[PDB]
Amino acid sequence: FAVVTQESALTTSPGETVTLTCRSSTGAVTTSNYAIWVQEKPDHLFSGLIGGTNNRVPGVPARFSGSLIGDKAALTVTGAQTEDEAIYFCALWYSNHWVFGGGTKLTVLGQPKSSPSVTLFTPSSEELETNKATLVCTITDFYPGVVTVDWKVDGTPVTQGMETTQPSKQSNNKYMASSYLTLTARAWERHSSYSCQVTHEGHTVEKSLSRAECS
Amino acid sequence: QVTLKESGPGILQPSQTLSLTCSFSGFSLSTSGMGVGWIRQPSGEGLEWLADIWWNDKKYYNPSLKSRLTVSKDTSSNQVFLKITSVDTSDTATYHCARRTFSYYYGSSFYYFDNWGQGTTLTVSSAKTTPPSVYPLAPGCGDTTGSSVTLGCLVKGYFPESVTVTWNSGSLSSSVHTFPALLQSGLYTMSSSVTVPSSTWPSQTVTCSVAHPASSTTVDKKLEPSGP
Numbered sequence: 001f002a003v004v005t006q007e008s009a010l011t012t013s014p015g016e017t018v019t020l021t022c023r024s025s026t027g028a029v030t031t032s033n034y035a036i037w038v039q040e041k042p043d044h045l046f047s048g049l050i051g052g053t054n055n056r057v058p059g060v061p062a063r064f065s066g067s068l069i070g071d072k073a074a075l076t077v078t079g080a081q082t083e084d085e086a087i088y089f090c091a092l093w094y095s096n097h098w099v100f101g102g103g104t105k106l107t108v109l110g111q112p113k114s115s116p117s118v119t120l121f122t123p124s125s126e127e128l129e130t131n132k133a134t135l136v137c138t139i140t141d142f143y144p145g146v147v148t149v150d151w152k153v154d155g156t157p158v159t160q161g162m163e164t165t166q167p168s169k170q171s172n173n174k175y176m177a178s179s180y181l182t183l184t185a186r187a188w189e190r191h192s193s194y195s196c197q198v199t200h201e202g203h204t205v206e207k208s209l210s211r212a213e214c215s
Numbered sequence: 216q217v218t219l220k221e222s223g224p225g226i227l228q229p230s231q232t233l234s235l236t237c238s239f240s241g242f243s244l245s246t247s248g249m250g251v252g253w254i255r256q257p258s259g260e261g262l263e264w265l266a267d268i269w270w271n272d273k274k275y276y277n278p279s280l281k282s283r284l285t286v287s288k289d290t291s292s293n294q295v296f297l298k299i300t301s302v303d304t305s306d307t308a309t310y311h312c313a314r315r316t317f318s319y320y321y322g323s324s325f326y327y328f329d330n331w332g333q334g335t336t337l338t339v340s341s342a343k344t345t346p347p348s349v350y351p352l353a354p355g356c357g358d359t360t361g362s363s364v365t366l367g368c369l370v371k372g373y374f375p376e377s378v379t380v381t382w383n384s385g386s387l388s389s390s391v392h393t394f395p396a397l398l399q400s401g402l403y404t405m406s407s408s409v410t411v412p413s414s415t416w417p418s419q420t421v422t423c424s425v426a427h428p429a430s431s432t433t434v435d436k437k438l439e440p441s442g443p
């Protein structure tokens with residue numbers, strides 16, 4: 001019933017050394033927790049990396065090493081390569097059960113950072129007929145693949161209504177994602193300003209719709 | 216040549232019983248150190264370990280799922296099973312089975328999750344097969360000007376999953392970005408956007424075609440400009 005924590009995202013460049021951690025909410029991670037490490041490649045491709053807490057599964061590149069640093073279990077990749085860009089999970093053992101961490105999105109820069117291309121669409125007339133008003137805000141061509149979507153109405157924030165998708169990879173190896181804000185035809189016609197606030201690499205890229213536009 | 220391949224139902228009504236099978240190759244549960252594990256990846260979430268069953272028939276379970284989970288092996292046929300009763304909404308995820316390995320090196324123990332199957336998907340929805348609603352995403356004001364213009368298609372409320380959209384522009388419907396499904400309330404929702412230069416629309420005709428084989432229905436929607 002413990003909570004296993006790992007960083008959410010880490011960025012590195014080819015040739016660099018990066019360390020990811022795994023911590024137990026109940027104290028120190030010892031050898032008795034037998035830390036495991038697995039890698040997730042796009043399209044449900046999982047591959048085991050570390051067993052015991054420092055033992056490698058045969059066949060795995062020699063650049064992945066595992067150990068215990070302080071009260072946490074760690075995973076170092078010496079000389080990261082572009083194909084190492086993936087999501088890494090870690091699990092700990094608590095006597096009779098395993099509990100996985102949240103995973104870490106690891107980005108190994110195989111190209112310069114790219115800001116997101118945002119676009120915000122308004123409810124179609126055909127949808128408005130059914131008393132429902134969906135807002136579609138598409139975000140593309142961003143890299144690293146970590147972004148943060150925020151919605152508003154008249155300047156005040158929204159705390160109910162959005163559902164953003166997990167970033168997918170494109171052909172150009174860049175990421176894309178899509179967020180929706182569902183309102184009723186009523187709530188839509190009772191406000192004038194709508195915005196999609198997209199955060200990437202510290203900076204914000206906000207888009208907007210005003211119901212007074214188009215003359 | 217170690218292989219693992221999971222088998223399951225796909226869609227399920229709440230309350231029903233799930234029955235997964237993990238057929239494997241390149242190893243046997245007769246030999247020591249061998250065993251198989253069950254892990255699931257809830258859509259939009261991380262991993263959640265389910266159960267472990269070894270060669271000596273030692274079973275290990277998820278504490279909260281205990282009362283509903285039951286793992287068993289068939290060394291004879293070379294497959295492992297997993298049953299999960301009173302399945303509800305929280306059980307829609309993709310299920311994987313992985314080879315568990317045990318090593319006792321110099322007093323030190325090691326436990327691995329080496330080989331994994333690609334997975335099988337399960338959607339626990341009470342909903343009946345429903346056709347998709349298609350709405351055209353024409354560019355609103357503010358930014359109607361510019362070099363190129365991005366159009367779109369909102370495909371809404373359908374079941375089960377699997378829908379394919381095709382764009383048709385009279386010049387260069389180049390940048391097509393199809394987005395993954397977002398199961399809202401038993402029915403899905405996805406989007407697809409295409410990009411064309413501001414001189415090839417409304418001039419050239421753009422239409423998005425939608426297909427839902429499970430229902431066989433197909434929709435063609437023309438993208439027309441949004442005005443006052």
Ligand SMILES: N#Cc1ccc(N/C(=N\CC(=O)O)NC(c2ccccc2)c2ccccc2)cc1
Pocket residue numbers: 034093095267269273317319324326
């Ligand atoms: N994954 C995993 C995992 C599975 C089993 C164990 N168990 C563990 N001891 C306590 C227990 O069984 O409760 N270690 C075990 C063990 C038990 C069951 C299956 C394999 C190994 C063991 C057996 C024989 C000699 C040394 C160690 C620890 C981790």
